[PDB]
Write a protein that binds this ligand. Structure first.
Ligand SMILES: NC(=O)c1ccc[n+]([C@@H]2O[C@H](COP(=O)([O-])OP(=O)(O)OC[C@H]3O[C@@H](n4cnc5c(N)ncnc54)[C@H](OP(=O)(O)O)[C@@H]3O)[C@@H](O)[C@H]2O)c1
Ligand SMILES: [Co+2]
Length: 159
């Protein structure tokens, strides 16, 4: 099983300026529950975005995709291709925009947090991947985050 997990604004923006323009503790807890114990695969830019104290995320095989053969991600594996990372029962791709697009052919699950923030797309933004007609979706109810933004979970799946 390869799954993708991400949070997006209603516009599809998932990242700006190398970070994320919101922070929902509830979504972080959801992310932790879904990924805990499994492989997590991330692009090098997303690894860069994690603070050194939080890196690697605990209890998970942290894998970083990079074309730099000498890139060092202390506490993580650095691989040059996505296929190298797929050696575990569950693999969660945790971003960013480039790696979501790269991993989508391998994917049968997408756990998507829609954040009710009106965030027009700007040049340089990272965006959520486009899901074609093979994906079947199940939508949760809108919830209030303590941060003040509403959010809802979509669970997309396909054979
Ligand atoms: N849920 C969310 O909202 C969420 C989750 C994660 C990240 N983000 C955001 O997403 C943004 C980063 O996304 P990004 O798209 O800019 O970069 P990214 O996908 O995180 O990492 C891009 C890097 O991955 C490596 N890479 C990409 N394709 C590769 C391939 N085919 N083979 C080998 N290595 C490859 C390269 O690393 P080298 O340059 O080292 O070769 C490339 O520079 C940040 O803003 C981050 O905060 C958002
Ligand atoms: Co699990």
């Amino acid at each position: 099983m390869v799954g993708l997990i991400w949070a997006q604004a209603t516009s599809g923006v998932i990242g700006r300026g190398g970070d994320i323009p919101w922070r929902l503790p509830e979504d972080q807890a959801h992310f932790r529950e879904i990924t805990m114990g499994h492989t997590i695969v991330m692009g090098r830019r997303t690894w860069d975005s994690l603070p050194a104290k939080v890196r690697p995320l605990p209890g998970r095989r942290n894998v970083v995709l990079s074309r730099q053969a000498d890139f060092m991600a202390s506490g993580a594996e650095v691989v040059g291709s996505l296929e190298e990372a797929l050696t575990s029962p569950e693999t969660w791709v945790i971003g960013g925009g480039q790696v979501y697009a790269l991993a989508l052919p391998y994917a049968t699950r997408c756990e998507v947090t829609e954040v009710d923030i009106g965030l027009p797309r700007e040049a340089g933004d990272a965006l959520a991947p486009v899901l074609d007609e093979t994906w079947r979706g199940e939508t949760g109810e809108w919830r209030f985050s303590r941060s003040g933004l509403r959010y809802r979970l979509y669970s997309y799946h396909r054979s």
